[PDB]
Amino acid sequence: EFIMKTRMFEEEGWIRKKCKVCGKPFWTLDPDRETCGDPPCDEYQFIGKPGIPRKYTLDEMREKFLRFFEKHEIYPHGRVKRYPVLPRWRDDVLLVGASIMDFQPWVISGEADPPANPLVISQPSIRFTDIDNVGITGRHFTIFEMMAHHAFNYPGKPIYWMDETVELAFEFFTKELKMKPEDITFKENPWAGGGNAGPAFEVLYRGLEVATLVFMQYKKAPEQDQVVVIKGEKYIPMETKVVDTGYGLERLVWMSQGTPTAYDAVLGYVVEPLKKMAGIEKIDEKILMENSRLAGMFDIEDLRYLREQVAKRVGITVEELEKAIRPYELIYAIADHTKALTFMLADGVVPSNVKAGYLARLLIRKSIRHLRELGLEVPLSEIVALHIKELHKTFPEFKEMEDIILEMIELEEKKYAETLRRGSDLVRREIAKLKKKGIKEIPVEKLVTFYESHGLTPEIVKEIAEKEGVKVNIPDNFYSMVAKEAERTLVDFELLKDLPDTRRLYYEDPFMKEFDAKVLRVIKDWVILDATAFYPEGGGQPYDTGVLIVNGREVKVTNVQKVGKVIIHKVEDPGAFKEGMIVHGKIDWKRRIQHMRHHTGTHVLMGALVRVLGRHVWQAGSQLTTDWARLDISHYKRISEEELKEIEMLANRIVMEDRKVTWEWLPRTTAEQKYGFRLYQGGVVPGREIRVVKIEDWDVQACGGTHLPSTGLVGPIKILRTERIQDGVERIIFACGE
Ligand SMILES: C[C@H](N)C(=O)NS(=O)(=O)OC[C@H]1O[C@@H](n2cnc3c(N)ncnc32)[C@H](O)[C@@H]1O
Ligand SMILES: [Zn+2]
Ligand SMILES: [Zn+2]
Numbered sequence: 157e158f159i160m161k162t163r164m165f166e167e168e169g170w171i172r173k174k175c176k177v178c179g180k181p182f183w184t185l186d187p188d189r190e191t192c193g194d195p196p197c198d199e200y201q202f203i204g205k206p207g208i209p210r211k212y213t214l215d216e217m218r219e220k221f222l223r224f225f226e227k228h229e230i231y232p233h234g235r236v237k238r239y240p241v242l243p244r245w246r247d248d249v250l251l252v253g254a255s256i257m258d259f260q261p262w263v264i265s266g267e268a269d270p271p272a273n274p275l276v277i278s279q280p281s282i283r284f285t286d287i288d289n290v291g292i293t294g295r296h297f298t299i300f301e302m303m304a305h306h307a308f309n310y311p312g313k314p315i316y317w318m319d320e321t322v323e324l325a326f327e328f329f330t331k332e333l334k335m336k337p338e339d340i341t342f343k344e345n346p347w348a349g350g351g352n353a354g355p356a357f358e359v360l361y362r363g364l365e366v367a368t369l370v371f372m373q374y375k376k377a378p379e380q381d382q383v384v385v386i387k388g389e390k391y392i393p394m395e396t397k398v399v400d401t402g403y404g405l406e407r408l409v410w411m412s413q414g415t416p417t418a419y420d421a422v423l424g425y426v427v428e429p430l431k432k433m434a435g436i437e438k439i440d441e442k443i444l445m446e447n448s449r450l451a452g453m454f455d456i457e458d459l460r461y462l463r464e465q466v467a468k469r470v471g472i473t474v475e476e477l478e479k480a481i482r483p484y485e486l487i488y489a490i491a492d493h494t495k496a497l498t499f500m501l502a503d504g505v506v507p508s509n510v511k512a513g514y515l516a517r518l519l520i521r522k523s524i525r526h527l528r529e530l531g532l533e534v535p536l537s538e539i540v541a542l543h544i545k546e547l548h549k550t551f552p553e554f555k556e557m558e559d560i561i562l563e564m565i566e567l568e569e570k571k572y573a574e575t576l577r578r579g580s581d582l583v584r585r586e587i588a589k590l591k592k593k594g595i596k597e598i599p600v601e602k603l604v605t606f607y608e609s610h611g612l613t614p615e616i617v618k619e620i621a622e623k624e625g626v627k628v629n630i631p632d633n634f635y636s637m638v639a640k641e642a643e644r645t646l647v648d649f650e651l652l653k654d655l656p657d658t659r660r661l662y663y664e665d666p667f668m669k670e671f672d673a674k675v676l677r678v679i680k681d682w683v684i685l686d687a688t689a690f691y692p693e694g695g696g697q698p699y700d701t702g703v704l705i706v707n708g709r710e711v712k713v714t715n716v717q718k719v720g721k722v723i724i725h726k727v728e729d730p731g732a733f734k735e736g737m738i739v740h741g742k743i744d745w746k747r748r749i750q751h752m753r754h755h756t757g758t759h760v761l762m763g764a765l766v767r768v769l770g771r772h773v774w775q776a777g778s779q780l781t782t783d784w785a786r787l788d789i790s791h792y793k794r795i796s797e798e799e800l801k802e803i804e805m806l807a808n809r810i811v812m813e814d815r816k817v818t819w820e821w822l823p824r825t826t827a828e829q830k831y832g833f834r835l836y837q838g839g840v841v842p843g844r845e846i847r848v849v850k851i852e853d854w855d856v857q858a859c860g861g862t863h864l865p866s867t868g869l870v871g872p873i874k875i876l877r878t879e880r881i882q883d884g885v886e887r888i889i890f891a892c893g894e
Contacts, residue, residue: 193341193360234272255279291488370400508884659687696778
């Protein structure tokens with residue numbers, strides 16, 4: 157659908173062709189090349205014959221790339237510090253998949269200023285869409301570093317675009333890594349991801365896709381026909397034009413090494429130790445190389461038949477070959493998965509049964525199972541330390557979160573031991589139920605139930621079911637299909653867009669309890685005003701209540717809500733109010749002064765929690781009433797009664813200390829800079845500016861509720877009780893005041 161001519165192509169005499177195999181547009185400097193350069197159209201042609209002159213380490217290669225764009229003569233890029241793989245700034249993706257995801261949607265919407273323009277970043281990325289490929293294809297990981305130079309072109313203000321991009325890329329490959337310029341190809345394919353799309357180039361070299369360049373000018377939907385489908389979704393054009401690049405670091409370092417897998421090249425410090433521990437034998441070469449070569453020719457969306465095609469090829473039976481490579485697949489996955497695990501846990505992912513947590517856990521189960529398949533009994537946490545020992549030099553937080561990380565593994569590995577036992581029994585029982593029910597195989601669906609609810613991988617369900625004559629049928633793409641199952645998924649509308657924003661008098665003065673305002677509109681029994689001291693529901697804090705005095709009558713405000721920027725007021729007498737009218741409002745103050753205490757107190761508590769429990773602690777939920785308040789956090793073990801006391805004790809020391817509680821609007825990016833992602837506790841607030849409440853040297857938080865000037869005014873905090881809401885979420889209940 158899109159064009160794809162660049163200056164460079166036109167000037168240096170590239171030819172655009174349609175691949176003989178797949179018919180896709182691609183750009184080659186070589187008039188012979190008939191295929192796109194991408195498997196299965198091409199093979200791996202760099203194993204033992206590296207495609208980059210010298211040998212690079214992960215650390216050299218990263219620093220190379222980073223330096224190149226940072227110091228570039230023509231376009232200098234701003235260097236940006238990598239983001240947590242746990243997307244604290246948004247609510248739509250579970251983990252960080254591409255580097256661009258760091259910048260959706262706020263930066264790409266010009267709602268938030270980019271940290272640089274252009275910018276260069278090395279971004280840890282996690283993709284479970286390829287989890288079944290790890291250890292098989294030799295090129296996929298769960299966790300890899302996407303290196304990227306990004307450029308945000310807001311209207312009437314270019315940085316750079318398509319032409320300059322294919323160049324800075326092509327420069328780096330040839331003038332930095334010294335790649336053979338007529339082995340580079342540029343395949344055309346659009347790229348969609350995390351809310352945006354655009355046409356893109358797949359940079360292909362010697363049989364391995366090493367980079368991807370996206371020219372992003374699209375945003376999703378919403379539910380109205382200047383639309384374009386990019387990958388079976390709907391987009392409309394967008395104001396910004398963004399340069400989305402993605403450079404496979406691992407893939408490049410593999411290239412400068414020619415080892416049999418990218419894993420041997422990047423994850424040596426884990427793979428080779430593990431080979432000794434398994435006592436596995438250094439595989440036959442005429443077997444190893446004639447499998448290493450053909451490995452890139454098969455993905456899964458039927459691995460069986462590749463196995464027969466390398467069997468026939470090399471000269472042996474499938475089992476004979478299975479025997480040979482199988483241990484290597486397992487070692488690679490373990491090495492990989494456990495690195496994914498190190499990055500997630502350090503970024504405060506707490507294993508559980510939902511969202512990111514679910515994933516960490518999945519990863520842990522698959523790992524343990526592989527260790528058991530290799531007949532190894534080294535604890536998982538020991539593998540993980542190898543990753544910490546190695547990476548804590550470049551990633552300082554791995555050493556800082558090291559105890560929480562290791563400990564978290566321990567407990568999950570303990571818990572698995574038992575979950576297996578009772579699960580094995582529970583499944584066998586309800587399989588024996590099915591043999592007689594007349595079922596000889598076990599559907600995929602049921603196999604996914606057995607993981608979802610019992611915690612059993614199907615390498616376990618297949619044996620248990622065969623020691624009773626039902627069949628071992630594991631889909632190749634199982635684990636990725638399981639990873640999909642990690643997420644799920646009103647009062648007044650319409651007549652509101654035309655009305656102005658409601659002035660929020662509670663933000664100017666939280667102690668304001670009386671005010672006057674003009675009745676802007678009276679839909680149903682909801683009254684709209686221009687300005688209001690009534691705090692609408694949201695934040696964990698419930699609505700304010702009180703009276704609106706109108707023509708000398710008191711009318712009760714029973715509910716205050718907020719649609720968009722317009723706050724609605726449920727009254728008892730919709731008749732008594734007319735558009736135009738001037739009303740005197742009075743807040744039910746007691747109810748409010750109580751709420752503020754439970755609010756401020758929640759932040760004081762939040763501070764204490766982090767200080768005892770540690771850094772992984774993040775709001776999972778909040779509810780307060782005038783009486784008690786509750787704060788669900790994300791934690792792994794139970795909060796002991798000795799801790800519960802230390803938390804409460806520290807909290808009360810701060811209420812005693814009477815520290816300043818101060819709030820101020822800040823542009824999103826300055827805010828995230830000054831204070832880090834901690835600000836995004838409960839929720840992720842929209843808009844160009846955010847309200848930052850801070851308690852002096854204690855807590856800081858993008859929060860929109862009404863607070864108190866000073867902690868003294870909270871009064872003592874009695875922690876009533878802690879309790880476990882679900883895996884990874886514990887709950888602290890308490891009540892403040894006199
Ligand atoms: C830039 C665009 N947003 C993007 O992320 N495209 S991409 O999906 O193709 O990723 C860019 C590069 O990251 C690397 N990459 C993608 N998936 C990978 C995986 N599973 N393992 C290792 N590297 C991967 C590849 O080198 C790829 O060329
Ligand atoms: Zn092709
Ligand atoms: Zn708050």
